[PDB]
Amino acid sequence: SVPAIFLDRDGTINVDHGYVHEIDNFEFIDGVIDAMRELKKMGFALVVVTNQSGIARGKFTEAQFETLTEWMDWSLADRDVDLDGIYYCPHHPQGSVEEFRQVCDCRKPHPGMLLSARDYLHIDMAASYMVGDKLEDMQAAVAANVGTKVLVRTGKPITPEAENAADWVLNSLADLPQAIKK
Numbered sequence: 551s552v553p554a555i556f557l558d559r560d561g562t563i564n565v566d567h568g569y570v571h572e573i574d575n576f577e578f579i580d581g582v583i584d585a586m587r588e589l590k591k592m593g594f595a596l597v598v599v600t601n602q603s604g605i606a607r608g609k610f611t612e613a614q615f616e617t618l619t620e621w622m623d624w625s626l627a628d629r630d631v632d633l634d635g636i637y638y639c640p641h642h643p644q645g646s647v648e649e650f651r652q653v654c655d656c657r658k659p660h661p662g663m664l665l666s667a668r669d670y671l672h673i674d675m676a677a678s679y680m681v682g683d684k685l686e687d688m689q690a691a692v693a694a695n696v697g698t699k700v701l702v703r704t705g706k707p708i709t710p711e712a713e714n715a716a717d718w719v720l721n722s723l724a725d726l727p728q729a730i731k732k
């Protein structure tokens with residue numbers, strides 16, 4: 551089995567401009583590509599796990615999401631970062647788009663996406679890390695037995711409740727390799 555870094559996307563990998571779904575509005579956060587490259591070198595699988603309820607809302611389409619996600623995967627590959635998995639949840643129970651209007655067990659704080667990655671990549675969850683900017687990320691992590699729960703400061707303001715549920719709070723994903731080393 552392998553340890554992993556589970557990664558939210560908006561606010562962790564890219565700047566959260568609100569419902570980001572276009573290549574020209576996708577901005578990698580400073581230092582995160584270098585950090586991802588270092589985390590792979592430290593033995594970790596890298597798995598994106600993202601809630602994308604804007605699809606259920608009709609803020610943008612699944613086609614727009616797929617297009618951006620393919621672009622993002624190639625962009626990282628071209629910079630020597632080969633993501634091991636990419637998981638997303640397009641659902642919302644109040645969704646306007648019928649196809650995605652539902653309750654599910656993949657919408658964080660539900661651990662579904664992390665459990666699916668666990669089984670697909672044979673992940674050692676106790677040895678793994680979840681990195682995000684929201685309470686729901688930390689709650690999905692505790693449910694999935696992720697050993698270390700990490701908040702970053704590059705996304706949504708950290709709430710006391712998110713802080714409570716986290717083990718570590720870092721400035722950004724760029725700080726994670728050094729924090730693990732230490």
Ligand SMILES: [Zn+2]
Binds near residue numbers: 654
């Ligand atoms: Zn879902």
